Structure formats: C-alpha cells, structure tokens
C-alpha cells in the first residue's frame, strides 16, 4: 500500500503487509524469480515474463513464515538510459508480485553507478532508510540471483557462462551467504564459477610511491619526463600533485593543435630553464619516440614515469571516480582497450635516462567512506 517511491536514480517499492526484520531474504528479479514466458531471451513485451519455477512461491511463504524479510535487487538500466518506461517497468513488478504473492519490497537500479549491482547502494539504502533502523544481520540472511558467474553447462542445454558475476559480486560485497536460483530454490549441488582477476579487495595505500626509491621524482634542471599509463587510472592526479604543483610544465598535445606547436611549446620551456611533463596516453615507443627526440635534440634527459595499472586496475578506477567525483571525465572502455592494443612498455632502448614505476595504489587522504567504496567490486 505505502507503494512506490522515485528517487534521481532509484525506485523503490514496498508492498502492502512488508515488514521491517533483522533478516532479509533478498533475490533478482530477471533469471531468477522470472523468465520470459515467450521462451527467447530477451522479453518480446513487458508481459513478456512467467514465474521461473513452480517451487518459487512455496520457498518464499516458508521464508516469510521464519520472520525473513523478502527484498528484490534489480539493475533496470533501461530506465535510466531512456529505453524502458518507468511507469511500465513498475507495472510489471506489480504484476509479478501479484503473482508471487507474498509482500515484497523492491529496490530498483535505474542509472550506472553506486546503486548498480555489484555496487551495494541498494543494500545500503535498504538498510539506512527503508528498514525502520531495524539493523540486519547479513550472516543470517541471503541473495539469491542468476549473474553468479558459472561456467557453461552447469546444467543440460547452458553451453553459455554466465553474462555476469554481477549478483554474486554484490553478495561479497555485503558480506550476504550466496546463491544461485537453482541452488536455493532446487536444491541443486553448487554450480562451478570464476570471480573476477582483479580484486579490489586486495588494493593497498601501503608501499613506496614509486620505485626505485633511490631515484628523485624532480630533477633541478630541465629534463622532458613522458608519463605512461591506461587513461582515468590516476596518471594525470599523480602528475598534478607531484609535478605541476612543483613548477612542471604540463604539456598537452591533445589541445595544442598540432607537433609542431607542441615542440615549440616544450622547446621554449627547456629554453627557459623549466622541466617539462607529457601526461598523454604515450602507449606505444612511436608515440614516445617523437618526445624523446626532442629532448636529445635539446640536450635534456628525458625520463619516462610507467603507472603500472592494469586494464581493470583503470577501468575500476574510472567507474569509481564517476561515482565520486563530479569533475571526472568518464574514459569509454573504447579509449582503454584501444590503448591496451596498442601497449608496448616503455624500455631504456628508447632513448630514456631512467624509469619510474609507479604501483597502483589507494589514494591517501580519501575518507573512510570512500576507502570502503573503493574496495567494492564495481563491474560484474
Ligand atoms: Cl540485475
Ligand atoms: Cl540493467
Ligand atoms: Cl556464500
Ligand atoms: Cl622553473
Ligand atoms: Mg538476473
């Protein structure tokens, strides 16, 4: 009855006879409480959907019957990118829960960012402002979805993986006991998955800021210092804290039209007794090669600065600073696996004087909050 509540980029809806509880029993919706009654894979309307086993309702009375209180978290992106209509989408969870009949409250995640699954915006709010600050406990609750990153054929007639680890991410997030649908409603023995390589749990502020530390990052006279690394991974923050603030120029190639004033810019600047920085995606010795030369050609060294993060390293980074950080401009994956393809790393053959490793490392002076956000798995 308290019906559905819109915020910028999130529904929520809380059926008539829901319960605020220390437990929830949580579940996706697509893949896991339904399927399409159509039998294709994509829905062909939005009744396109039938209940996705007959064991579904008895298992969800027999949890409202032991006190758990029965929640849905769904990624609806189609609402925020314009393709699926709010107001229909909630007629449709309307009408599944008609059809499940038990009170459910459903969080819906209609834009990117911190409420879409794996990120744990949803359980948050769940939590903070839709529990009566009931506090749950999750050792004692669940989350049951589809996206749980099996490996194919798990089961007669799946000779396709998993699309996603995306449910199963956003329980170990939380710290919720997981399940596939077919585990928890069927009782079938545990399906065989892959996480993801990169743990962003594993992600340490520790260690030096760059190797080896016998090295300066400044040197006092003019030097070209060619910064390499994936782009939205931290490059170009690194380079402003350590090097322009320290009187670096930055020199920009992007927005200086052309080679040609870009060599001019940097000669003048060696001319004028200051260093000089390229923050630029330098990926490959070609790209490097025009920097270097002119350095030799100016009779400075030229340093090379290697960030060492990997692809999913940046692309973890990238969609952390656009839920963060209001100034961020978001790189597409396009621009990341274009430089990927294209990576040679750099090596002293190429005219360098040294070069710097720079880890990948947590950013120091981001606030606890933000530290644990950090640390969440944000792509399934
Ligand atoms: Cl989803
Ligand atoms: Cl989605
Ligand atoms: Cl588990
Ligand atoms: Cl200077
Ligand atoms: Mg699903």
Redesign the pocket.
Known sequence: SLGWESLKKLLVFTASGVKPQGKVAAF?L?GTLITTRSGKVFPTSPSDWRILYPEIPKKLQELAAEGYKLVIF??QMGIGRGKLPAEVFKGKVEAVLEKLGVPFQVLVATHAGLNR?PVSGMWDHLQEQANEGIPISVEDSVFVGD?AGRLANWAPGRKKKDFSC?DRLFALNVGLPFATPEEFFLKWPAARFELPAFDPRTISSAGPLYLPESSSLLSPNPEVVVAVGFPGAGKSTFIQEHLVSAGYVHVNRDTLGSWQRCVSSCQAALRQGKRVVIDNTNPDVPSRARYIQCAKDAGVPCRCFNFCATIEQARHNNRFREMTDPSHAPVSDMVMFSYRKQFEPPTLAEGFLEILEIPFRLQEHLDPALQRLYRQFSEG
């Open positions: 996706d697509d769904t990624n699954k996206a995306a």
